[PDB]
Ligand binder design. Structure first.
Ligand SMILES: O=C1CCCC2=C1C1(CCCC1)N=C(Nc1nc3ccccc3o1)N2
Ligand SMILES: OC[C@H]1O[C@@H](O)[C@H](O)[C@@H](O)[C@H]1O
Length: 386
């Protein structure tokens, strides 16, 4: 089941590490959670709908401003790239920051580089995280949003919440070489406890769908395996949208995609069929969840996974084996791969009482080492007072 430390443990760990690294007590502290997507995969960059929820796994940042004008960072996460420490001067008009080594610091460097407010002072900071790094629960986005929320303490920002999510997204593109969508940054910033967020990535309007049923559990199963094909999938969708004269696959419904089948590639048609169908499935999933129809929600999860496995082809044999094992347990409503795919985690919605047997059944039928997280919908990025 694997324990989830709470803000008190992470804050204390981060603050003890700060004292034993910089001599003084930290002056500021922030946290930003990871996320799991209940449904709506690879609709992100297609101006579609997603239904993520923030997790109890989070990244905590403690620090203090400096008069030096340098940034000094240390992270305690064991999976972090080596070295665990890095120091650099703040960017100027002449010289700007550039991505490099270690890779974990590029997320921090990107947000600093693209931070819209000034003057930004130097700072010392310690980073702690309970999000498994690169495990498909968007550890990077939690670090980007935590960094942004920390910098707001150094110098308050003026833009909208959407502008903050796009800054962290701009950091991921340039400093991490990953052309991701907006969901991970958005849900980390905007999550609310006991609620999933139906996010329209075209209008950035959000809808809060409550998930605070004690008889309901969300189970995260990390496959522990491992994105070469993610870019390619993005441009196949843009070519299909361009071929149909539309700005994005959000503007295309299944009937028009079927009517224009001969205007696009055979693979391109199979990618758009998932994207257009998945957008519709999340709208149906949100509605099913509002009225408490967990069985209908679970069936939409299974359709989403099979669609990702056959039409979008972004699943792997380990994920498919984890989903089929979970689907055999009654009291599991549905199971599905989450994140970009090619490994990572599977999300499962199930009855709370069935969680112990589900984990034993999933583990027994998996040809690897599966790690489990039982998570509730958590709050978004928040300032912590020391
Ligand atoms: O090389 C990769 C592979 C693709 C995914 C990705 C990375 C690494 C893991 C190792 C360094 C780079 N890290 C993240 N995210 C992340 N690193 C953190 C460090 C400290 C606190 C919170 C953090 O969240 N994502
Ligand atoms: O649905 C796939 C998702 O995969 C994530 O890893 C990515 O950061 C999101 O933007 C979204 O595209």
């Amino acid at each position: 089941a694997l324990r989830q430390p709470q803000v008190a443990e992470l804050l204390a760990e981060a603050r003890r590490a700060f004292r034993e690294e910089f001599g003084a007590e930290p002056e500021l502290a922030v946290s930003a959670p990871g996320r799991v997507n209940l449904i709506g995969e690879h609709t992100d960059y297609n101006q579609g709908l997603v239904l993520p929820m923030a997790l109890e796994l989070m990244t905590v940042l403690v620090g203090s401003p400096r008069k030096d004008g340098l940034v000094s960072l240390l992270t305690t996460s064991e999976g972090a790239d080596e070295p665990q420490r890095l120091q650099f001067p703040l960017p100027t008009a002449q010289r700007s920051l550039e991505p490099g080594t270690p890779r974990w610091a590029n997320y921090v460097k990107g947000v600093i580089q693209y931070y819209p407010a000034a003057p930004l002072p130097g700072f010392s900071a310690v980073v702690v995280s309970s999000v498994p790094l690169g495990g498909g629960l968007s550890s990077s986005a939690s670090l980007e949003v935590a960094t942004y929320t920390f910098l707001q303490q150094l110098c308050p920002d003026s833009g909208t919440i959407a502008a903050r999510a796009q800054v962290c997204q701009q950091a991921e593109h340039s400093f991490a070489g990953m052309p991701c969508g907006i969901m991970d940054q958005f849900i980390s910033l905007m999550g609310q406890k006991g609620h999933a967020l139906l996010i329209d990535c075209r209008s950035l309007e959000t809808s809060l769908v409550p998930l605070s049923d004690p008889k309901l559990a969300v189970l995260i199963t990390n496959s522990n395996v491992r994105s070469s094909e993610y870019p390619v999938r993005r441009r196949q969708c843009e070519e299909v949208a361009r071929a149909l004269g539309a700005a994005s696959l959000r503007e295309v419904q299944l009937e028009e995609l079927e009517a224009a089948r001969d205007l696009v590639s055979k693979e391109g048609f199979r990618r758009a069929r998932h994207v257009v169908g998945e957008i519709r499935r999340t709208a149906q999933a949100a509605a099913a969840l509002r009225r408490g129809d967990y069985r209908a929600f679970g069936r939409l999860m299974v359709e989403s996974h099979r669609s990702l496995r056959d039409d979008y082809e972004v699943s792997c044999p380990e994920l498919d084996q984890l989903v089929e094992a979970a689907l055999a347990v009654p009291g599991v409503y549905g199971s599905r791969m989450t994140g970009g795919g090619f490994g990572g985690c599977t999300v499962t919605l199930l009855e709370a009482s069935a969680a112990p047997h589900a984990m034993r059944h999933i583990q027994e039928h998996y040809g690897g080492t599966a790690t489990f997280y039982l998570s509730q919908a958590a709050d978004g990025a928040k300032v912590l007072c020391l």
